[PDB]
Design a protein around this ligand. Structure first.
Ligand code: HEC
Ligand code: HEC
Lengths: 104, 104
């Protein structure tokens, strides 16, 4: 994969709620440093909600791929609400941009 | 409705297949200039497939909003494939970025 494009994807779609760097802060979501090979729900200092902890799954390329591919199946209600809030704002911003750009 | 954020979303999520500018090129998808207030399937010069045309739907703020919220209502199988191909590439670039950034 192209890490430079992946960086832009991460900024746009995740960085509002997650940091990746060693010792980076917990925000809406947990810091993700050390994620690869860690069991779900094991970021130190982050208060997970009921669903995430009870998996027994190890994060890696393949589990991330399945996670991202059908998030609704696996994300808990809390994150679903936060994500839906961000997606509603993104839609309104996109439509705002389109009504400007396509009529300029 | 933040037009500048809307632009960034458009670049990331749509600009591979769409232009918005007057006289802008048709690419995988139709140029979008003048979209608002136009019926579905009426971009001049563009070769559509069946499942979009002859709707009688007029594009606007609300129909665009529903499109983004419920794409199954509007996107044909052809576009589903193009978008699914794109999302897979996105997932691989994001995962590649994460395996670098979360291990730095
Ligand atoms: C962009 C595509 C991403 C990616 C790759 C991830 N997120 Fe999130 N995340 C958020 C919250 C509140 C949680 C915890 C939910 C709970 O309490 O159980 C998470 C959790 C994750 C994980 C699991 C981490 C673990 O340590 O087990 C992963 C891998 C993850 N996220 C990746 C919050 C958000 C958002 C808030 C609106 C947004 C946007 C994202 N996350 C985006 C992404
Ligand atoms: C980013 C979220 C967007 C937005 C806002 C739109 N698209 Fe696409 N698009 C693609 C193709 C092949 C078509 C034609 C499908 C067919 O033959 O019917 C479209 C169509 C649209 C429309 C309808 C346009 C019309 O004139 O009726 C609209 C409003 C629209 N798009 C907006 C192809 C793609 C992609 C290829 C992988 C990508 C990505 C997008 N479109 C993204 C977006």
């Amino acid at each position: 994969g192209d890490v430079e494009k992946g960086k832009k994807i991460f900024i746009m779609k995740c960085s509002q709620c997650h940091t990746v760097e060693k010792g980076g802060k917990h925000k809406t979501g947990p810091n993700l440093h050390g994620l690869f090979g860690r069991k779900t729900g094991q970021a130190p200092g982050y208060s997970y909600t009921a669903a995430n902890k009870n998996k027994g799954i190890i994060w890696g390329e393949d589990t991330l791929m399945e996670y991202l591919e059908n998030p609704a199946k696996y994300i808990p209600g809390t994150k679903m609400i936060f994500v839906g809030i961000k997606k509603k704002e993104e839609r309104a911003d996109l439509i705002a941009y389109l009504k400007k750009a396509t009529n300029e």
